[PDB]
Every structure is written in C-alpha cells, then in structure tokens.
C-alpha cells in the first residue's frame, strides 16, 4: 500500500474534512480501517 | 515461544539464520579415505513381481 | 467459549412502575429465549409480544417448535437499567458455572441433564405480566431429562387421539398432571412427520432377523425376572407372541460379505436413539453441585456446568 | 493475549502444500487408507462391486510416484470443481492448483482424487467418515516430500504467532466457489453472530456421482439445520431414494399380505399360546405364520444427501466478510476472507 | 409399425421428462389421440411429392444406409452420424390440426432403460429448438445408421421400430438410387 | 535411435536388442512410466538405468552435475529389513557414481 | 385414459444457483385443452385411382 | 444376537475382539434392551400403518416414503399407552449408547501417532 | 427460489392406448407393390 512510517511525520496537513469514500476513483490506493486494522503493523 | 501441552509448558526456542556461500568456484573438498563395514550383504535375493 | 465470556444486554425502557420494576429483581435466575446473539436487544423482542405468529395464537406443543429456532439464555443479573444474560451455545462465563433457580415442583439430584419445557402443569402457569408495558414474560420450566422425554411423549400422543387415560405422571411417587387443551392441526403434523421419518429409517434388511427373536423373549421372560419386568405389563409384543410366530427369510443377497445385524443397529442408534433430541431441544445443561448439598430443593439456586 | 491450542504433525506433502497455500487455509486429515478396501468390502449395499474402491484409491498411489497424510481445502475444492455454479471461478481454483503445487502432472491426480470420491460413495464408505477436520495454518517448515505443519485445533485464529515478526498473524482464506451464506439467501439480514458449517453433498446414481464441499455461514444452531439443508437440495434427496437403490433384487409380486394383529386381538375365538408352549412344534405350528421380505427397500444408508459438522463461530456484532483476490504467484483467485474466527469443531451428523 | 404394435403393448417412456399434476390431464388426451396419429403419420409421409420426399430425415437415413450396402447430397447429416449408434436424426410432425412436416433441415439429437437427449454442433425454424418428446404439438420420428427407428410422443413415450427387416430394395435398384442421390467422399 | 551407433562401443548399435530399444522386454518391466513394479516396496536397482524420463529431465552442465552427486539422494534404505524403496520420509546424502 | 405413474407428485424447493441433476420439464401451453383440437387430415375429393 | 465378526481395522493395524466365556454372559442385559426396543418399535409403527411390509418393495413403498418426506402435504389394544412407554426406554438408551466424547488429542512435540502405553496430550471443546 | 409440484420420470411410466378392432385393416398399412399413386 503506502508507507505508514512516512505518514507518521507529515509534510503538511489538510484543512477541510470530507467523506473521502465518495471520491474513490481518483486514487491508486484506498483502504478504509474501522478502528484498528491488523495489517497496519 | 510459550505454549502449554501436558500440564508442562514447552518453551520452544528458534533462531533464524542464513547461509551465503561467497566462493566463486569450488572452495570445499570431500575425500573418501577408507571403507567401513558394508551394509548390504552381497548375496542372492532374487526379485519377485 | 470466548476468552472473556459473552454477555448480552436486554434493554429496559424508561416508563416502568416501581411495583413492576421491584418484581423483576425476582428474576435472578431464569431462562430467556433470544432470537439472535446481538449484544443489545429489547424487551419487545423478549416477551410473548414478539412470539405470536401471523394471526394464529400458539398452543403448548407448537411453542416447542419455535424454541429450537431460538437461543436459550440465562439471566445472571437484573440491573436497574438493563438485564444481563448469557447464552448457552456460545459460552457460559469465565468459570463456566452459571447460577439458576427452580420453577419446578420437582427436586433436582446431581448429574441430571436439564432440559427446558413450557409451563404445561396445572397450578403452575405463573408468568410476570408487566402492566406498564403490556409485557408477558413466559419463563419455561427446567426439568430433569427423563421427565422431559415423557412430557413431550405425552403431548404428542394426545394429538394422535384427536385425529380419530394419558395425563398422569409420577416422579418420586408424587402424582402431578397437566392441562388438556385442543391442539392445532399444524404443529401436530409437524411432529407426526418428525416421528415417522426418524422411525422408518430404523428399519433395515437386518431387522428381519430380530423380528424372529420375539417368540424367544416371551419364553425367556418366564425364566428370568429381569425380562418380564422389561417387556411391560401394558406392552405390545406380549400380545404379538400370542398371535404371530414369525420366521426369517431363507437366503440373502450376498450373505457372506456383509453384516445385516450390524447395519440394523448402527442405523437404529442414529435415528431412534436420536429421537429424544428431535422432538425436544438439546439438553445443554446439567447440575454439578460443588459444596452445597446433594439434592437441590425447589425454589433454591443450583450451579450448572455444561454438557452436550 | 487469549488462550488457543496448537498442533504439530510431520506430514507427507502428497496432497497439501503449505508452500503454495499460505497461512490461513483449512486442512482435512484422513484415516490410514489400508482400512478403506475392507470397509468398502463390509458396509456395501448388496448387489454392488465392493472392490472398486481399492482399484480407484490404488491408481492414486500408482500416480504419486512419477503415511496417513493431509488434504488441504483448496485441493478438495478443485477436485470437485467440475460441478459448481460460478464456473468461471471454479476454473480459477483449478487454474492455480496445477501451476503452484510442488510437483509435475498435477492433473493426473485431480482426475484421480475426484475419481476416488466418485468411488467413495458407490462403495458406500462415505468420505465424511474419512475426512476429519484439522486446524488452520499459522506456520510451516518445508522440505522435499514432507513438511512440519503447525495449526490451531482450538481457539481464535487471530492470536497464534506466525513466526515472522513482519506479519505476525494470519486470516482465514477460502475460495469463493464454496463460501455460501444463508443470511442473504434466506432473508435474515439482522445483526448477530454466525456459525460456520462444512457440508458434503452426495448424489447416488449408477456410476454418475458427485461431491460438493462448502463452508456455510449461518445463524442456525446444529439443532435447526436439517430443514435448511433439505431446503436447497430437495431434488437430491429425491434422486437418492429413487435412483440409489439398484441391483437389490425384489421378491415380486406381493408375497406379504396385511398384518393381522389388530384383526385377531379383538376376537375371542383366535387361538393362542402361553410362554411354556412357544418354541414347540405341537403348539406354535397352529398359529399364524408371517414371512416378511425386506429386499430392495431404500434404507437410510441408501437415502443420504448431506452431512454437516460444526466448524466454529464469529462472535462479533455482525460478521465481517470481505471479497478480494490475492496473488498466488502468477494466478489470482476469487477469495472470501473471513475475519476473527474462533475454532470449535464437532461430530459429523448424517442427514439421511 | 405393425410388427411393433401387433400384440397389445405397454409403451413405457424411453426419455426423461418430469411432469406436472395438471399435466396428467394433457397426456390423458394423448391416449385417446394415439391411433389417429399413427394413420396420419403414414398419410402425410404418403402425401408428399416424390421429388420433395427426399428432404426428410427418413429418406436421408435410407440413402445413408444404401451407401454402405458415401455422403448423401446437401450435407444434412451431422459429421458424427457414422460414429456410434445413438446418433439419431429426427422429424417433427404436428400433433393437433393438419398433420404436416415442420422441418427445414433434418435435426440430429444424440442420446444414450432411460436416456437423456442432447443436440449437437452445426435461416431459422421454430421446431429446431425442442428435444424429442419435450412438448405438445410434436410427434418425433427418428432413425439410425442401423436404420432402426423410434417414434417419440409428447412426454418421452416411445417404442423402437426395425425398418431394416422390411426394406425390400434389390441391388441394381439400390446402386442406381445411390449414384443419383449421394456424392463420393474425397 | 538405432540408426546411430553406441557412444561407448562405436562399432555396434547396442549390446542388447531386448533391453535397449523402445518398447523392449527391458523397458516393459522396469520403467516408472509404465508402472509394473511400483506397488511392491522392494527396490529394483535398475530403476535409474531404464527410466528415460529421469535422465532427460536432468541438465548437462558438468559444473553442477559433479557437486550434485556429492550429496545425491539414495534410492535404497538401510533401516529396511531386506531392501526397500525409500519411504517419502527419509533422505540419505549418499554419493552416486552411477 | 390416465397415464400410469407410480409416484403421485413431490414438492421441490429450488434455489436458482444450486440446480443439480439437470433434467427437463414437459411444456404444456397456457390456453385450455378444449381449444387443442383432434387432428383432421382431409381426404382429397378425388382418389389417386 | 447370533447366540439366539470380531475383526477390527484401525490405522491399518488389525485388531481382534474374540480372544468370550464370561464376556458373553456379562453383556447380556445390554442385548435384551437392544432387541426389545427395536421389536416394540417395528410393531407399533406396523400397527399404525398396517401396510409397511405388504406394499411392493420398489413400486409402492417408495411412493409412500416420498410423501412422508415432504413437509407441505397435510377388546382394546393398549396402543397409545405404548408410544409413551417406548419413548421412555428408547429415549434413555440414546444417552448411554451415543457415547458423547469428552477428550480431543492435539499432539505437540512428539509422535503424531500415539502408541499403546504413551502419555497423550488432551484438550476439551472450549 | 421457485416452488412447483413435481412428478418423477421413472421408466415404469407406461401408457395404454386402445385400438379399434378394424384399425389395422386400413388401406394404408396394407399397400400393394404397385399402386395408382
């Protein structure tokens, strides 16, 4: 997927919060995590 | 690793290892020196089908 | 069983009078049918308000046929806001011991497999009706196993009379009886089919031999006292010996390579020996008293540890 | 850190491959196959060939050379895969069995092990007597022709340490040709826990037999499954009764008239005998004679259609099913991924 | 046909077609309807013109038999007609009304007690859709490379007919008929 | 191929007409590919001589054929009573000149 | 005139996916059987003789 | 029942059950319940349906059995005083003759096959 | 799903038609070798 350690130190934060699951088609990788996923670690 | 079987608790110990053979070409020799006792008796056991 | 047990919540609404709420703390141990394994249910699912079918009110016999389509659970504690139960199929508790309470007029010895039965007994049909919410909580009656095989066998036999006495029980020499009501033709055909399919499957080609042992028993019962007290005084085959002398079929089809008697006995233990579970539900529950007594009286708690 | 039980068993890799199938598949053990040509010799219905099974199982042992092992679930599904419904995915389960398992000419086994299961049912040793549940893979150490299998025979799947601290868990992996719900297919869509049921399917005809393995997720207990397994397979229970009984020879026409006990019990003029008179020819040979025939009757062992067993449960508020495809080398498979499964087996139960 | 129905028979069904309880009422008329069909079999086969008779499956089964005594013209037979004895080629006559022939091309259905039916490989005719004895309004009349026949009634009720024990064509009449209506295999 | 000569002795096509050619009496008895004698556990020592499917699957580079015969897998066993074909369990690093 | 059948009839639930033992059913039309007339083959007014 | 077979095959390892003197006599109460409960059962159902043996063995008997399977189709003998009593006895033998298992063996650090005289590990259903 | 009644196609299913007495004495089942047609 994507590097989870890289997102631990972010280079810049978003501002507006929007349901991302509506805009799925723009993305190469997309994964919803309910509370804690096993494959996060 | 800790897991209990039989009242007692097995403590299985593992260790992951590696083998890299950094020899371009042959770097090891086996030399057959002497002959101990032959296992098979050189006899006549004819074969069935 | 889960590693930390499984405990549902049965939600209580807000408007309940204190002469109704203080009468629910007498439900420290009861039996409640759940339809799901949801962690948060409602009282409107628990009561007999949720039981009734389309238009048709249930009898006492077809009431069994929606038990096995539900999940029997045991209340461990009534809290002031909710009722906490524990299902019997998922897992009991951490320890596996679950405290109960008798509704029975019948004492409990150790090692008795408990099945549950509707309140069929006369002078017994006591349910807590909540006037504040129209709620009727039918609590079934835990019984020992060999009574539960009888009472189901009584009520199925009663309906077969009505397609064309019986109501007398005994346990430890105490006469007790049950209610006589008309029965719906639907749930009787659901039971008559469940008998005969589980019964005709017990007839095998090897049963031709065992029918020819019937005249031997009737003579053997006249020598051993174990066998005349086995047939019965009101039996059937005793009247079969005075009329019909059977004899075996002569030859068999491939009578060397097969065991006819062994086929008839394995096919008997899987259908007729299983029959006490088909009509009723599964006896999950039995009694293992640790330190209290040997026999638990009526109206007293009793620890319970699981069983197949 | 909950409680779970482990297994270890040194197992021949003839039919199951933990190199190909990764962590999280079902496993099915077998009895030692030396008893199979005798149980088929013994429990067979009359008028059939008993020694067909030893020839069929023989040709499998005569084809793995070109000891009670273990059959992984993906091998069993792909063997019986020529009789499913989603046929496109059924030819994707077979499409990686022949291309990922360590070995050559895998198709000579798949057209043999399924042919063995075509001979299990006619020789009447039913495979649910032979197939036994065994746990799911959490680690494996492999070598040529044998491997060490460590499974979980009891407990939750999601707790056993894998051995790799890179991915120190697993998840149950099943092909999408067998995971059949009974939630969406019965109308019951409410939340709640759900069970897991393995189901074999039989179809007894003259040399035209089948096998279908499923992992059925439902909310019914084992006490309330017998109508639902008849609900799907109503024709199968019919054709097992009517086409199952063959070459059992009937005595024709009706040698047996009516059974006269009820006609003779109410009359006082009927002759009788006491206990001291029976088994004597001067008393019993004036009674009624009754010679019943039971030949060609479709017995319950000749009228089976299914056989279930427990497999475990899903203790969440709602089951978490997924639908993905993961890569087995160069072939990808329709896979249903089940999350948070606790393992509790049970006895097999015939649905005759 | 007379040899197969001389003594009073019981026509058991040779095919596999499940019924309905309302559908007993339809087959009950087929009993009453039965001997009138067998006449209008022989009437409508007689009623064809002799030039147009040789498009039927019956004529193309005789010419496929006199050839072995080559491929008949037009290539109506399937490519696997001479492989086993179950590869039949049928006709379809109407049950009700005027008994006619309802086929462009003779239709080949391979079969296997009971046996199921199955089409083979191959502008459009409606009667090409349905198997023999599958529906009402279809008498079926099929033949073999053995030139043993079958008459399949609605529901799968049928009886086999040996035509080869009655076809009386001499050899110079035969080979004068073959060379006119077949083609030599390359 | 018996239009060509034997690479060992080059003046004859073979030394056995009943063993060397295809479908011979020697082939029909001792090939894995026909399976006459794979049901019995007793070893046939000429199994590696006649089974043509095994040699054609082997490679040709003498750099690796020599080391692989330093630790080849023997077809016999020593724990067996008389002499058995190997169980699929055991592996014995026994060197093969043959 | 009823066709002899040993079996009266059965009740078969069929989920559309799990169709197995593919046999075929006998098609009868939707109009009633009073319209399905007896077959009439009209003789010609003249004879071939 | 023969008195009025001893070959067992498990694991590909032949057993024998014959080796009979007191074993025939000791088991006699087991036999006499197994015979009677079957022969009572096969006569009451034979009394309820007096046609289970007089039907043809493959025409009529299969006709009646299939209608029994379908859900949606709806002096004095002591007859109904026996269906109670026969299910007391047959309901009892279903407990002692099913032999509900208590124990599962899951091997770990040892032999896969447990031999006669070993110490085998034990789990119960959780 | 779908629900329907169901009659099994067994090979014992026969059918008994009735012939008239003068049926086979018909001028089409009895043809000479040379007709006027």
XYZ file of C-alpha atoms in Angstrom, chain E residues 10-176:
167
model
C -47.377 -51.105 -22.829
C -45.487 -48.106 -24.209
C -43.100 -47.216 -21.413
C -41.333 -43.897 -21.756
C -37.760 -44.104 -23.010
C -36.880 -40.487 -22.197
C -36.597 -38.301 -19.098
C -39.244 -35.584 -18.732
C -40.696 -34.554 -15.389
C -44.397 -33.756 -15.394
C -46.887 -31.594 -13.565
C -50.018 -32.677 -11.690
C -52.080 -30.514 -14.023
C -50.126 -32.060 -16.898
C -51.636 -35.509 -16.358
C -54.747 -34.033 -17.990
C -52.844 -33.340 -21.211
C -51.347 -36.809 -21.575
C -54.794 -38.263 -20.902
C -55.908 -36.889 -24.251
C -52.796 -38.324 -25.967
C -54.118 -41.810 -25.160
C -57.408 -41.049 -26.931
C -55.462 -39.241 -29.663
C -52.946 -42.070 -30.176
C -54.197 -44.243 -33.092
C -55.304 -41.272 -35.203
C -51.693 -40.001 -35.213
C -50.270 -43.307 -36.487
C -52.546 -43.143 -39.521
C -51.685 -39.529 -40.301
C -48.053 -40.443 -39.959
C -48.468 -42.744 -42.929
C -50.815 -40.327 -44.707
C -48.524 -37.292 -44.556
C -45.472 -39.346 -45.499
C -47.510 -40.628 -48.440
C -48.868 -37.133 -49.104
C -45.500 -35.631 -50.017
C -44.462 -35.238 -53.625
C -41.800 -37.798 -54.646
C -39.379 -35.041 -55.613
C -39.863 -33.330 -52.243
C -39.799 -36.552 -50.201
C -36.011 -36.702 -50.295
C -35.553 -33.728 -47.930
C -36.904 -35.600 -44.908
C -34.835 -37.358 -42.271
C -36.341 -40.696 -43.267
C -35.140 -40.544 -46.872
C -31.703 -39.332 -45.795
C -31.432 -42.267 -43.395
C -32.206 -44.781 -46.143
C -29.676 -43.252 -48.537
C -27.075 -43.257 -45.769
C -27.794 -46.986 -45.430
C -27.847 -47.918 -49.106
C -24.446 -46.249 -49.468
C -22.830 -48.658 -47.048
C -24.665 -51.582 -48.635
C -20.550 -42.024 -49.473
C -22.352 -38.964 -48.107
C -25.902 -38.035 -49.177
C -26.381 -34.783 -51.005
C -26.859 -31.428 -49.317
C -24.832 -32.423 -46.196
C -27.840 -32.612 -43.882
C -26.400 -35.454 -41.820
C -24.050 -34.457 -38.990
C -20.346 -35.148 -39.264
C -20.588 -37.737 -36.459
C -23.586 -39.681 -37.762
C -21.449 -42.739 -38.522
C -19.628 -42.928 -35.177
C -21.957 -44.609 -32.680
C -25.493 -45.978 -32.805
C -27.075 -43.328 -30.616
C -26.627 -40.517 -33.140
C -30.187 -40.299 -34.428
C -31.745 -37.810 -36.871
C -35.355 -36.822 -36.195
C -38.506 -35.450 -37.797
C -41.173 -33.265 -36.193
C -44.840 -33.653 -37.097
C -47.691 -31.613 -35.686
C -49.962 -33.359 -33.199
C -53.077 -31.194 -33.482
C -54.774 -29.896 -36.604
C -53.463 -30.779 -40.039
C -50.613 -33.247 -39.565
C -47.731 -31.690 -41.503
C -43.947 -31.755 -41.578
C -42.361 -28.926 -39.618
C -38.690 -29.015 -40.603
C -36.298 -27.285 -42.973
C -33.245 -29.411 -42.192
C -33.324 -32.841 -40.543
C -32.410 -32.459 -36.890
C -29.785 -34.616 -35.187
C -30.025 -35.325 -31.451
C -27.612 -37.766 -29.823
C -28.846 -39.962 -26.976
C -27.547 -42.699 -24.680
C -33.924 -48.034 -19.858
C -33.983 -44.242 -19.850
C -31.614 -41.859 -21.614
C -31.406 -38.096 -21.887
C -31.304 -36.081 -25.112
C -28.648 -33.692 -26.394
C -28.223 -31.592 -29.535
C -25.001 -31.410 -31.499
C -22.903 -28.843 -33.353
C -23.973 -27.311 -36.661
C -32.365 -19.303 -41.751
C -34.319 -20.352 -38.658
C -37.176 -22.712 -37.846
C -39.048 -22.732 -34.542
C -39.253 -26.523 -34.274
C -35.444 -26.770 -34.115
C -35.477 -25.568 -30.513
C -37.039 -28.512 -28.710
C -35.850 -32.021 -27.909
C -37.847 -35.109 -28.940
C -40.943 -35.642 -26.830
C -40.294 -32.455 -24.894
C -43.569 -30.684 -25.694
C -47.068 -30.863 -27.104
C -47.627 -30.492 -30.876
C -44.553 -32.578 -31.743
C -44.560 -36.154 -32.858
C -40.962 -37.218 -33.329
C -39.713 -39.722 -35.889
C -36.003 -40.541 -35.801
C -33.700 -43.087 -37.423
C -30.239 -44.599 -37.233
C -27.284 -45.608 -39.371
C -28.564 -49.082 -38.403
C -31.915 -47.874 -39.806
C -33.666 -48.782 -36.592
C -36.354 -46.244 -35.811
C -38.105 -44.628 -32.882
C -41.422 -42.789 -32.628
C -41.308 -40.320 -29.746
C -44.663 -38.969 -28.471
C -45.098 -35.927 -26.174
C -43.660 -36.842 -22.791
C -40.969 -39.262 -23.900
C -43.232 -42.257 -24.535
C -41.657 -44.185 -27.399
C -41.047 -47.593 -28.936
C -38.281 -48.765 -31.245
C -39.042 -49.867 -34.806
C -36.855 -52.062 -37.018
C -37.343 -50.839 -40.582
C -34.295 -52.764 -41.910
C -36.127 -56.099 -41.708
C -38.721 -54.841 -44.206
C -36.993 -52.512 -46.706
C -37.020 -54.554 -49.917
C -34.759 -52.906 -52.491
C -32.725 -55.072 -54.831
C -29.070 -54.332 -55.527
C -29.350 -52.849 -59.087
C -32.213 -50.661 -57.857
C -30.087 -49.669 -54.849
C -26.901 -48.666 -56.673
C -28.976 -46.842 -59.275
